[PDB]
Write a structure and sequence with these properties.
This protein starts with 11 loop residues before the first helix and ends in a 25-residue tail after the last helix. By secondary structure, it is mainly α. Helices cover about 40% and strands about 0% of the residues. The radius of gyration is 17 Å and the shape is globular. This is Luciferase.
């Protein structure tokens, strides 16, 4: 089992967004207590098995989010967990804009999210569908008995120190 190190991306949310089913209804709440990697390895274990790549998920997970977007679709971007800001700049603050999509910045909120998601063309057909049909893993159900499963209703909560990333 994993202990030393682990992945460097979030599939729980990524796969959720890809899901075609009416899971969005349960997404209205989502886990507001962060999810441990223990569940990530499980969820990703299914996607990777279908034939998924790291750069793919990482691309969808490393997607940028605008301030006006969240205003319309709050709780859809920036994953479920985050904290620890950055701030500072030296010459100017940071802005969320796509070089391949100028209008995207001044485009609808829903179109914005899809704009980036579509940009990431590093995902395979089998992986794209695998993420949506990934289904809620056993662990995911135990932690998310509300949205997933229909019996579980417990929670422990693990603490640690892990973080990174942060590009342009």
């Amino acid at each position: 089992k994993p202990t030393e190190n682990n992945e460097d991306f979030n599939i729980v949310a990524v796969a959720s967004n890809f899901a075609t089913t009416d899971l969005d209804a349960d997404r209205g709440k989502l886990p507001g207590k962060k999810l441990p990697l223990e569940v990530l390895k499980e969820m990703e274990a299914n996607a990777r098995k279908a034939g998924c790549t790291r750069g793919c998920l990482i691309c969808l997970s490393h997607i940028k989010c605008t301030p006006k977007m969240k205003k319309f679709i709050p709780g859809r971007c920036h994953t479920y967990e985050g904290d620890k800001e950055s701030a500072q700049g030296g010459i100017g603050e940071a802005i969320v804009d796509i070089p391949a999509i100028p209008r995207f910045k001044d485009l609808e909120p829903m179109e914005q999210f899809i704009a980036q998601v579509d940009l990431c063309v590093d995902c395979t057909t089998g992986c794209l569908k695998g993420l949506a049909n990934v289904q809620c893993s056993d662990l995911l159900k135990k932690w998310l008995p509300q949205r997933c499963a229909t019996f579980a209703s417990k929670i422990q909560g693990q603490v640690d120190k892990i973080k990174g990333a942060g590009g342009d």
